[PDB]
């Protein structure tokens with residue numbers, strides 16, 4: 109059984125380039141007992157891979173999740189044709205013993221793409237759900253600031269915020285994303301790349317300030333938002349994508365006098381903190397809200413495993429509208 | 437009657453200097469009904485004044501709290517001789533209508549100096565109390581890092597943590613402060629100015645990391661501590677004294693990837709958040725611990741109201757062992 113694999117050939121400096129990756133064709137051993145052979149159907153690329161790749165050694169497989177089908181099975185719990193979520197990395201075929209696999213929701217309907225299991229009704233959507241509902245702790249009526257608002261996490265954060273009864277101000281990197289989020293129902297959406305003054309734009313978007321900040325971006329942008337947080341404002345620190353592809357020193361930290369005077373609470377989190385009953389409940393909620401039309405989705409599907417590095421680089425640079433997914 | 441007052445002659449640039457302050461003598465009017473004339477007994481100087489002074493206009497009185505005696509009274513709740521806490525700023529005498537005054541605890545004993553009402557058994561001690569017990573939420577058996585650990589706040593934090601069963605690692609700016617806290621029994625104390633490597637020093641002090649960080653200092657020092665926090669570690673942001681006198685940009689912030697991976701919770705606070713029963717209970721706990729010897733105190737008492745700017749500047753430089761107090 110053959111497989112293709114994208115490995116890290118050279119550690120990224122700034123943004124990745126194509127020569128930092130190397131495609132390798134490898135032979136897989138026959139299935140041992142209890143194992144299954146998985147064929148990737150859809151693979152995801154996500155911002156955290158830029159950071160996690162710094163702990164790889166050159167020659168290692170790029171990390172990542174995929175929706176796959178069992179093509180050969182020596183495990184009766186996972187017969188041939190079963191669809192699963194698996195994280196073997198950027199590889200077309202992989203062998204698993206079944207412990208590290210997740211079946212899709214039992215009521216997953218024919219009407220929603222399986223690829224949403226890597227997005228809105230998968231790990232990005234769960235990140236939004238717990239970051240907003242538990243870390244920010246929205247009760248309804250808050251003004252929420254969300255950046256990278258057209259990504260899979262941010263778009264879910266903003267739409268959950270709307271259905272919980274919040275005002276949502278979203279920052280995105282292109283005019284195409286501005287129009288998209290306005291159609292989704294965000295109260296204010298703006299292109300942070302072209303606005304004359306981020307501080308002025310945020311003050312006009314909410315003269316009263318912000319109760320909650322769902323922060324995917326970090327850096328100088330968050331320093332500006334911090335200066336417009338209300339007293340006891342809550343910040344959920346989900347990512348710092350503005351720093352992942354940085355070439356020099358990190359930007360200044362936030363102004364402590366404002367942080368202290370406003371008694372801000374800032375908590376970072378990773379989606380894996382939540383498991384079991386909480387996590388199954390959240391996936392069911394996300395699926396229900398999608399079916400009810402309260403959460404709309406959009407995917408940027410790139411065809412061909414050979415284009416995974418390019419999909420990752422375009423995703424990191426904000427070139428793609430919707431969740432970037434690679435179709436095998 | 438007459439009063440002397442220290443005013444802000446010019447906004448501070450960097451550390452305050454002598455030329456930034458101006459002493460003025462003024463005439464107070466007669467007492468209207470319900471008012472009292474107050475004579476300062478002890479005045480405090482504190483780091484927050486470096487920050488709050490930025491909001492003053494030139495010519496304004498410097499802000500701050502004092503222990504005062506009622507020397508003349510037209511208010512039956514405050515007879516002559518009553519000792520109160522009041523915040524008229526840096527002034528020897530003032531008129532108040534009673535609604536902005538605080539009587540000392542009813543049970544205040546003759547064995548502890550009245551000046552402690554501005555320190556260990558006053559706002560600095562309360563800051564330590566709530567910051568540690570409610571913001572860090574220590575339970576017993578944790579490892580706590582506290583900086584400015586020989587200050588009025590830090591020394592209470594470390595000693596409360598000790599009586600709750602925690603390992604305490606303290607950072608201070610002089611060998612005299614190191615020796616004093618080591619005698620008090622803090623598990624590890626070091627002079628952050630002289631260590632060969634702050635990272636190595638913190639590693640040896642707690643190989644497994646820090647559960648709680650009580651932060652008075654901020655800046656680059658806190659970046660190093662954040663890198664050694666345990667998962668779900670809790671930071672109480674009380675002050676950032678290392679930044680208050682800065683003349684240029686703030687240092688970089690912590691590596692965002694470490695904050696996220698360790699899922700840290702960082703919350704800033706000011707003691708005034710707690711009022712009523714919560715504050716009274718805390719003050720009585722602090723008094724009880726002092727009487728029982730579980731909290732030792734130290735004061736640096738400067739004689740003469742004319743020396744208040746010098747006391748303020750010495751305190752900001754860390755030149756004094758013990759809470760800095762001015763005896764009128």
Ligand SMILES: CN(Cc1cnc2nc(N)nc(N)c2n1)c1ccc(C(=O)N[C@@H](CCC(=O)O)C(=O)O)cc1
Nearest residue numbers: 154155156160231232235259260261262379423431432
């Ligand atoms: C699976 N997962 C949780 C998560 C978070 N941090 C990690 N960090 C590491 N080191 N390793 C992990 N496996 C990991 N996993 C995810 C996956 C995607 C996104 C995410 O932010 N995706 C983008 C994708 C954007 C796009 O496709 O354009 C988004 O904004 O939705 C977050 C968490």
Ligand SMILES: CN(Cc1cnc2nc(N)nc(N)c2n1)c1ccc(C(=O)N[C@@H](CCC(=O)O)C(=O)O)cc1
Nearest residue numbers: 482483484488559560563587588589590751758759760
């Ligand atoms: C009264 N109080 C609460 C507090 C805190 N921040 C404020 N900030 C502002 N702007 N305004 C206030 N009134 C204010 N009050 C205090 C007072 C002192 C310390 C403090 O940290 N004192 C020094 C004293 C050290 C010394 O005297 O040598 C220390 O670090 O221990 C903290 C809070």
Ligand SMILES: [Cl-]
Nearest residue numbers: 256280281426
């Ligand atoms: Cl963007």
Ligand SMILES: [Cl-]
Nearest residue numbers: 584608609754
């Ligand atoms: Cl110090």
